[PDB]
Design a protein around this nucleic acid. Structure first.
Lengths: 228, 134, 150, 125, 132
RNA sequence: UUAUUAUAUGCACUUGUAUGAUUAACAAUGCGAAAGAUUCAGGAUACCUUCGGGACCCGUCUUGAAACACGGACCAAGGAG
RNA sequence: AAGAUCAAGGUUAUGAUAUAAAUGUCCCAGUGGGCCACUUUUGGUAAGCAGAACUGGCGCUGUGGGAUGAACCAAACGUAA
RNA sequence: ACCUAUACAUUACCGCUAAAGUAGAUGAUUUAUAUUACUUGUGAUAUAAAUUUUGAAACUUUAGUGAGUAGGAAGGUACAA
């Protein structure tokens, strides 16, 4: 049930693995199966299976040889630790601070205002959009976005129109807007637990009644010596 | 007196059938068994005895008229149709294509015959397509 | 066929109509039709010079003996007749482009021998003309490459 | 400030024979395939020796073919001449060999073939 | 629409401006058609800054983008139907460009044939015409 | 005597590393929406505008020409190794 | 004394390099009016003067720099980031 | 510390030079498998799939470099016949 290494990632060329494999080393027990099988069948009764020569037969359209798949190396985060209260410096929620809930497999952030205070939804935003401020909300109470995954907020649906299948349709479905009930319920539970932790800290720019206010680096104030 | 070496070298620039339109390096072959309009060495009349020609149909679309090569025997002296041999086929492409691989003991061409096959589809098809319509 | 040899009876042909009947069956038809259609008014200035234009040099018919071949042949457009004695380079390779369609009479083709005897034997008209010995015997390079021996 | 990519970088020597001759280049093409594919310097220089201008190719006479026979370790020898081969009247006795040449003058072909030798093309050599 | 010729790297036209010949803006006698300044006084020849650009090879386009129209199709001067038929196999490198000397009656045949072959024509609207 | 390193570590699979110009995983958006034709991106075409910087008149003899050196108002066509 | 025949010899007997070099043909153009600077100098009080020695530029060379500039400095220019 | 030439470094790209191969297609080569031979594992053969018809007086492939008058050579373009 195992045997591993390669601490090459620190070094960066090197060992542990070669050396230990040698200590362990067999000199005995080299016997193997591993069954291949095709299913290229002329199974003929009359059932007669084939396939023949479909075509890769020269309708010479020169089409660009597919550049295959770079590695899924796990997106090493900056010390944006969930729940750091951080600034969305960009895109409609421009200069509203929000609390981090999670890291997802897409690389990018889960952000909630809390919703009820600073009007920011269960909303996902780039690691780069964000200045990660020193202020920390206790992220232990949460249902966690184990339940909110890439797929969950993926849109149910931008059909090009009225569900079904080719009904010669009409201008305007709901590309951004109904809203969905499943998504409301998800917010309200998470936000409620946010509000309990967030109320412990005193009013001003950005935790509870602190949350509402819309950011001020006021005239004569400094984005560079703000050690956010 | 005939070589598949000399006959291109003779004709390289001085071919009536090789018409050069604009700059454009090389090439254009009209030479009646080109298969690729190229004009290279082997996309041509002799060569010797390896020359597929495809002509549709006349009255669309019974026939992609295949002309079967004819080595060595006849010299390929005029002509009794000898460098060619008129197998008028029918029906469904993929068969004619696999069927061509078998007669290709002479595999030199293989793509060329297929370029003519696939291209002749576009020539034969526009009367029952060239739409859309669902 | 190539080289196209036809019966010596071809030479006797008094009439143009009779000539065309022969030639077509003998398989000239498409190439004689290549001529007449193509006649077109000269693009130059060359039109004023009596250089009215170029129309297609179809076929060179060769005869040993003129029994009324020439007069019949003269009429038909782009069709030129020559004697085995004279065999003009201009007629055989027009524009230095090798590959005239040549038809020979049976007596004419036979007479091409002592005219230009072979390699061994003398060109009887053409005194100290040795018709050139080829620099490559086979000239087919691919078989020589193929080769077993190589 | 390239010190110094002056000259000469245009060099000297023909890649390909300065001749329209369709025959000549076929021999070059043949021996060019034979060069790297079979090693050996006979292929390497005969390729070059076809490149040669008419000067540097001056006609080798039949008595020069006959003096080479008098050489030791040479009786079984097919004499290569990349050249025009010219008839020398003065050699009374012309010895047997097969001679391979680009061109052989017609009077020179008769005295090789009388010897009784073969006049040979380089593609058959 | 018409399917573009064979995956090009974006056509760098690299100097776009017609070289215009030195002092064509001074003189209508000196034609915009480029003629290189050979002359001993030339500030253009000694390539002082601000005296335009002399066609120097390094403006030269990539040998891949050589000839391609930006809808891909290189220009073949099509005299008629048989000429069109050459580019049947060569849809994906060449376009039929109907020579200006060709009459409308033949153009209707050329355009019609072109649609069958599915090879691009650059100019159809050529000689069309609310006319006889 | 001890440490270190390499060899004795095969076979299967692998979106693993490189393979010597290794940009793509992943995703969003415009949109090809029949003809018709929206929308997006991109541009010193002609020419206009706005900003910076650079641009003195060619031909020529001459050591050197923008010269307060000489021919050339402007344009067409003849026109000279 | 040469030509020179024969036998003996560990490592080829300073250092970097070779953009390959040598050689021939054309009897080829273009040139036969030079100009400037470091250094060295003659004539002359001297000259942006007349004339050498060595070497580099300019002549045929912009660009950056000396505000400017044929020549001084830095540098030799395919096209761009 | 900063600024900054067409210099300098790297990269794409032009050209010129360099340097190497390319030319068994009744054949070659790759891939998958069934059979057979040997052996662990490989080849032969059969079958199915795929690539390959090269201006081989050019391409693929490669690297180093480009001022330029006089002048020389090379290769095109236009014009009338």
């Amino acid at each position: 049930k195992g045997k591993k290494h390669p601490v090459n990632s620190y070094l960066k060329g090197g060992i542990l693995r070669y050396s230990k494999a040698q200590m362990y080393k067999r000199r005995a027990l080299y016997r193997l199966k591993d069954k291949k099988s095709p299913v290229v069948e002329k199974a003929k009764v009359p059932i007669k299976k084939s396939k023949a020569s479909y075509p890769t037969k020269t309708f010479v359209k020169k089409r660009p040889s597919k550049a295959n798949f770079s590695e899924h190396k796990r997106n090493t985060r900056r010390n944006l630790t969930p729940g750091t209260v951080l600034i969305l410096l960009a895109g409609r929620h421009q200069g509203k601070r929000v609390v981090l809930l999670k890291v997802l497999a897409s690389g990018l952030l889960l952000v909630t205002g809390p919703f009820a205070l600073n009007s920011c939804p269960l909303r996902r935003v780039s690691q780069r959009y964000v200045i990660g401020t020193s202020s920390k909300v206790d992220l232990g109470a949460f249902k966690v976005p184990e339940h909110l995954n890439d797929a969950y907020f993926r849109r149910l649906k931008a059909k090009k129109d009225k569900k079904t299948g080719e009904a010669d349709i009409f201008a305007a479905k709901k590309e951004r807007f109904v809203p969905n009930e499943q998504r409301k319920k998800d917010q309200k539970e998470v936000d409620a637990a946010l509000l309990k932790v967030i109320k412990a800290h005193p009013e001003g720019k950005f935790f509870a009644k602190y949350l509402q206010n819309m950011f001020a680096l006021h005239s004569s104030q400094y984005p560079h010596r703000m050690r956010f | 007196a005939t070589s598949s070496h000399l006959n291109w070298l003779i004709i390289r620039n001085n071919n009536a059938f090789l018409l050069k339109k604009r700059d454009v390096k090389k090439p254009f072959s009209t030479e009646p068994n080109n298969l690729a309009s190229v004009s290279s060495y082997r996309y041509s009349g002799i060569v010797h005895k390896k020359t597929l020609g495809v002509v549709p149909a006349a009255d669309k679309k019974g026939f992609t008229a295949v002309l079967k090569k004819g080595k060595y025997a006849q010299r390929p002296a005029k002509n009794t149709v000898r460098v060619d041999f008129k197998a008028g086929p029918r029906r469904s492409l993929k068969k004619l294509k696999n069927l061509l691989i078998g007669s290709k003991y002479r595999k030199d061409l293989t793509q060329a015959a297929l370029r003519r096959a696939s291209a002749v589809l576009r020539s034969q098809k526009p009367a029952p397509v060239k739409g859309k319509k669902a | 066929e190539f080289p196209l040899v036809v019966s010596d009876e071809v030479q006797k042909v008094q009439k143009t109509k009779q000539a065309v009947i022969f030639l077509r069956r003998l398989k000239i038809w498409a190439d004689i039709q290549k001529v007449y259609k193509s006649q077109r008014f000269r693009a130059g200035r060359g039109t004023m010079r009596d250089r009215r234009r170029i129309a297609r040099r179809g076929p060179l018919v060769v005869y040993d003996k003129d029994e009324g071949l020439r007069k019949a042949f003269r009429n038909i457009p782009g069709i030129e007749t020559i004697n085995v004695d004279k065999l003009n380079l201009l007629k055989l390779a027009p524009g230095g482009h090798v590959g005239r369609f040549v038809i020979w009479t049976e007596s004419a083709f036979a007479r091409l021998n002592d005219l230009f005897g072979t390699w061994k034997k003398p060109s009887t008209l053409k005194k100290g003309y040795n018709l050139p010995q080829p620099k490559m015997a086979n000239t087919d390079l691919s078989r020589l490459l193929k080769s077993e021996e190589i | 400030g390239i010190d110094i990519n002056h000259k000469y970088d245009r060099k000297v020597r023909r890649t390909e024979p300065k001749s329209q001759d369709v025959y000549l280049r076929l021999l070059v093409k043949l021996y060019r395939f034979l060069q790297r594919r079979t090693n050996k310097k006979f292929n390497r220089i005969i390729l070059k020796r076809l490149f040669m201008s008419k000067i540097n190719r001056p006609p080798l006479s039949l008595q020069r073919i006959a003096r080479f026979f008098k050489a030791a370790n040479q009786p079984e020898s097919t004499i290569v001449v990349v050249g025009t081969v010219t008839d020398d009247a003065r050699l009374l006795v012309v010895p047997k060999l097969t001679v391979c040449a680009l061109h052989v003058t017609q009077t020179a072909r008769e005295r090789i073939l009388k010897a009784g030798g073969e006049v040979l093309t380089f593609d058959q050599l | 629409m018409t399917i573009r010729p064979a995956y090009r790297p974006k056509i760098v036209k690299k100097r776009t401006k017609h070289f215009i010949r030195h002092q064509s803006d001074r003189y209508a006698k000196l034609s915009h058609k480029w003629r290189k300044p050979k002359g001993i006084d030339n500030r253009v020849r000694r390539r002082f800054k601000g005296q335009y650009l002399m066609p120097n090879i390094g403006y030269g386009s990539n040998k891949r983008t050589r000839h391609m129209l930006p809808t891909g199709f290189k220009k073949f001067l099509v005299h008629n139907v048989r000429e069109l038929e050459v580019l049947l196999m060569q849809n994906r490198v060449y376009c039929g460009e109907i020579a200006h000397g060709v009459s409308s009656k033949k153009r209707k045949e050329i355009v019609e044939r072109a649609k069958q072959l599915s090879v691009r024509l650059t100019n159809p609207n050529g000689r069309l015409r609310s006319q006889e």
